[PDB]
Design an enzyme around this catalytic site. Structure first.
Site, PDB file in Angstrom:
ATOM      1  CG  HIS A 173       5.639   5.926 -11.449  1.00 12.10           C
ATOM      2  ND1 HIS A 173       5.559   4.597 -11.089  1.00 12.10           N
ATOM      3  CD2 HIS A 173       4.423   6.461 -11.186  1.00 12.10           C
ATOM      4  CE1 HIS A 173       4.348   4.340 -10.629  1.00 12.10           C
ATOM      5  NE2 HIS A 173       3.639   5.454 -10.676  1.00 12.10           N
ATOM      6  CE1 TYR A 230       1.363   2.257 -17.063  1.00  9.53           C
ATOM      7  CE2 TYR A 230       2.754   0.520 -16.146  1.00  9.53           C
ATOM      8  CZ  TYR A 230       1.535   1.175 -16.205  1.00  9.53           C
ATOM      9  OH  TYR A 230       0.508   0.750 -15.389  1.00  9.53           O
ATOM     10  CE1 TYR A 231       3.693   3.855 -14.042  1.00 14.50           C
ATOM     11  CE2 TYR A 231       5.693   2.542 -14.274  1.00 14.50           C
ATOM     12  CZ  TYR A 231       4.377   2.663 -13.861  1.00 14.50           C
ATOM     13  OH  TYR A 231       3.741   1.594 -13.268  1.00 14.50           O
ATOM     14  CG  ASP A 244      -1.110  -5.959 -13.512  1.00 13.67           C
ATOM     15  OD1 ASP A 244      -0.018  -6.049 -14.114  1.00 13.67           O
ATOM     16  OD2 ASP A 244      -1.878  -4.979 -13.630  1.00 13.67           O
ATOM     17  CG  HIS A 303      -1.483  -0.453 -17.927  1.00 15.46           C
ATOM     18  ND1 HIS A 303      -2.318   0.208 -17.053  1.00 15.46           N
ATOM     19  CD2 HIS A 303      -1.064  -1.567 -17.280  1.00 15.46           C
ATOM     20  CE1 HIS A 303      -2.398  -0.476 -15.922  1.00 15.46           C
ATOM     21  NE2 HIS A 303      -1.647  -1.557 -16.035  1.00 15.46           N
ATOM     22  CG  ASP A 317       2.458   8.128  -8.425  1.00 11.76           C
ATOM     23  OD1 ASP A 317       2.318   6.893  -8.559  1.00 11.76           O
ATOM     24  OD2 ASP A 317       3.361   8.642  -7.728  1.00 11.76           O
ATOM     25  NE  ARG A 326      -4.984  -2.690  -9.756  1.00 11.77           N
ATOM     26  CZ  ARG A 326      -5.621  -1.727  -9.095  1.00 11.77           C
ATOM     27  NH1 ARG A 326      -6.883  -1.895  -8.712  1.00 11.77           N
ATOM     28  NH2 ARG A 326      -4.998  -0.587  -8.827  1.00 11.77           N
ATOM     29  CE1 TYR A 381      -0.430  -4.312 -10.672  1.00 11.18           C
ATOM     30  CE2 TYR A 381      -1.676  -4.080  -8.627  1.00 11.18           C
ATOM     31  CZ  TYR A 381      -1.401  -3.665  -9.920  1.00 11.18           C
ATOM     32  OH  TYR A 381      -2.105  -2.621 -10.473  1.00 11.18           O
ATOM     33  CB  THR A 428      -5.594   3.500 -11.037  1.00 10.55           C
ATOM     34  OG1 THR A 428      -5.319   4.526 -10.079  1.00 10.55           O
ATOM     35  CG2 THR A 428      -5.164   2.160 -10.460  1.00 10.55           C
ATOM     36  CB  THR A 429      -0.844   6.361 -11.790  1.00  9.43           C
ATOM     37  OG1 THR A 429       0.553   6.354 -11.457  1.00  9.43           O
ATOM     38  CG2 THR A 429      -1.449   7.698 -11.338  1.00  9.43           C
ATOM     39  NE  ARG A 474       1.019   5.063  -2.980  1.00  9.34           N
ATOM     40  CZ  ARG A 474       1.174   4.312  -4.067  1.00  9.34           C
ATOM     41  NH1 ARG A 474       1.420   3.013  -3.955  1.00  9.34           N
ATOM     42  NH2 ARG A 474       1.080   4.867  -5.270  1.00  9.34           N
TER      43      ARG A 474
HETATM   44 MG   LIG Z   1       1.491   5.463  -9.637  1.00  6.92          MG
HETATM   45 MG   LIG Z   2      -1.870  -3.122 -14.688  1.00  4.30          MG
END
Ligand SMILES: [Mg+2]
Ligand SMILES: [Mg+2]
Ligand SMILES: [Mg+2]
Ligand SMILES: [Mg+2]
EC number: 4.2.1.158
Lengths: 375, 375
Positions: B45, B89-90, B193, B246, B42, B162, B164, B296-297, B15
């Site tokens: 996580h 979630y992941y 978020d 989510h 991704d 957005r 966080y 999105t991830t 990144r």
């Molecule tokens: Mg991700």
């Molecule tokens: Mg979110």
């Protein structure tokens, strides 16, 4: 007192039936030469992927290196931070935390020259009643073979069994009918386990027909889909027999407690992350005035011993438990396996420090497997 | 038309910030020479373990070998049987199924010589509004940095973001103040978020002070712990703004619908198992008269394109979405990288069969990583 190293030994031990379950034996070394042993029991469950043990040893070492083994609360918090609970029955992260936490108990116990039992709250009893499993029938032709299994294990002292049902009800009923006929009251089937295969209403109908046979029946286990708290509740209201369900995460247990969804909490270190987490689960059950039974994923001697000590320390176990894993395997990796007698699992000699179980290097090597890959 | 082989390419693309996420590019080959490409987006996580890709390729091939790619319902069922939903979630199994199902969509569309858009229900619009993420502030010292981010991204056409929040309300507050100050209505922050960081009562307090700032605010996302349905509900009742969450499993989504716990369902293929699963989730929301937004991830171009097609086929997306993953990476493994114009993600050329994205072997090799191990 500090952790200096970690070892993970992958082993594959076949069951008498042929399937080779993969486990990981854990060794936690310290600066004083004391080593704690644990077991990441039965990785052979879905999902159909496998964990890289080389990468895992690195991650776990970074977490444990230099830590004081007595810091169980701190260490477990970090383990959970890295291996979150997922409300999934067979989360591999739970097996992993389990092996580590249990190894820490053995380690601390050894350091103090006391039995793990004395580190867990002492003894309430010296043995706990367990049962042998009869896996679900798919065809009526499988019945005769299972009756032989019953007769064989009864002969060895196991008078209590648990039957997995739901796949073929006609077969389930045939088996129970044949069992009542031949063994009368010599044998008890303490649980009918649906393994989350049926929706609660379908389970209700099944329960209604199967319970025509009550051979010392103690509970109906997992009679609804995973995490179906409301379904468990409704079924509990329509069923006279206690409803039991496995505890795989605190969130899931919390919900079943709040909704008074079940009667018996089936707790097993491997599915909740170890002895530390299993005790918290058992105590949470206790605070809520709920019954508990020790479950199983079919662990080897090291993992079974963990439950032997835990089981003999709890006041709220009022039914027959399930850990008889060693009975399904053709071998193990210890010098002396756990002790069963008349259907009871005994907590290792309280005079022996640690877990009371000792690894056998020749057997670890014999059953060694390169990784945890599937077949 | 049958599947004959499978390829899994592990890739690591840094990144702009430095962190190197790992993804797996999927290739599903057939007897007729057509290849479908997908992306297991991704894997970086928690939990802190990594999946063995050599073993994974064998397991997936055993499932897919010889199958008709058009049997999407059959294949997805088998994928779910081997990689169960875990209300987490992941869950890595979700990323895995996602890559496969998405590749199957590309493959099928290519075979029919049509865009994936036309295999998913056609077009309702040609593009969908998206936003760029401003990650949570931990120290007020970071406000300046994030303000520079907004200025640069606004200059590049992204007028919606957005934010966080939840770590440092003072910082979140300062940032929101500085943004309203410098940009005014030039920029919009469509979502605050909380990423499940706060219990619902604490989030309520945060929401009350953060919403003093309303720059085109559209929703409050994840203002309760993961799977805290009752918390979301109570908070949905006290909050004027729509609550979004989510969707990571059908069970979780079913419960949020049953309890009317949220207003907007944030759906992303990677967290639910692919396009087939994401469509089912979106349609379930539709039957329930609920709004949807694409989440999105931070996927790469292949993964982002999947959502571009999906998003432009849905009638119940009435808010700004989140897929701007490509903007965070220094590169990709495609010939035609996904780009944005005026804060919009356009569906790929409807004239180009398949997903409309082509892999670049040179870049695939450049960003190749030996495995998905952690650092
Ligand atoms: Mg991700
Ligand atoms: Mg979110
Ligand atoms: Mg059970
Ligand atoms: Mg097992």
């Amino acid at each position: 007192m500090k952790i200096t190293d970690l070892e993970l030994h992958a082993v594959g031990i076949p069951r008498h039936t042929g399937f080779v379950n993969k486990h990981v034996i854990v060794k936690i070394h310290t600066d004083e030469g004391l080593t704690g042993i644990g077991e990441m029991s039965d990785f052979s469950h879905l999902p159909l992927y496998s964990v890289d043990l080389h990468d895992l040893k690195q991650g776990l070492l970074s977490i444990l290196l230099g830590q004081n083994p007595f810091d169980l609360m701190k260490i477990n918090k970090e383990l959970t931070d890295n291996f979150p609970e997922t409300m999934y029955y067979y989360e591999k992260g739970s097996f992993i935390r389990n092996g580590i936490d249990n190894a820490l108990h053995d380690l601390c116990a050894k350091y103090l020259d006391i039995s793990v039992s004395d580190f867990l709250g002492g003894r309430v009893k010296e043995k706990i009643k367990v049962c042998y499993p009869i896996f679900r029938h798919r065809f009526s032709e499988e019945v005769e073979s299972n009756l032989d299994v019953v007769r064989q294990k009864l002969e060895q002292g196991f008078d209590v069994f648990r039957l997995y049902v739901g796949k073929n009800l006609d077969a389930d009923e045939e088996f129970l009918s044949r069992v009542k006929e031949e063994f009368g009251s010599r044998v008890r089937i303490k649980s009918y386990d649906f393994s989350h295969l049926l929706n609660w209403k379908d389970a209700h109908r099944a329960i209604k027909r199967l319970t025509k046979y009550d051979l010392g029946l103690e509970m109906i286990e997992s009679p609804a889909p995973r995490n179906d708290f409301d379904g468990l509740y409704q079924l509990r209201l329509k069923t006279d027999y206690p409803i039991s369900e496995h505890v795989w995460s605190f969130k899931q247990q919390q919900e079943m407690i709040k909704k008074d969804a079940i009667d018996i909490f089936n707790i097993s270190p491997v599915f909740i992350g170890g002895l530390t987490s299993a005790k918290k689960a058992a105590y949470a059950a206790e605070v809520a005035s709920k019954d508990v039974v020790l479950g199983t994923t079919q662990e080897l001697s090291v993992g079974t011993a963990a439950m032997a000590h835990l089981g003999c320390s709890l006041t709220n176990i009022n039914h027959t438990s399930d850990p008889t894993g060693p009975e399904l395997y053709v071998g193990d990796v210890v010098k002396n396996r756990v002790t069963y007698k008349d259907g009871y699992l005994y907590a290792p000699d309280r005079s022996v420090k640690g877990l009371g179980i000792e690894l056998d290097e020749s057997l670890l090597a014999k059953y060694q497997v390169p990784d945890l890959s599937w077949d």
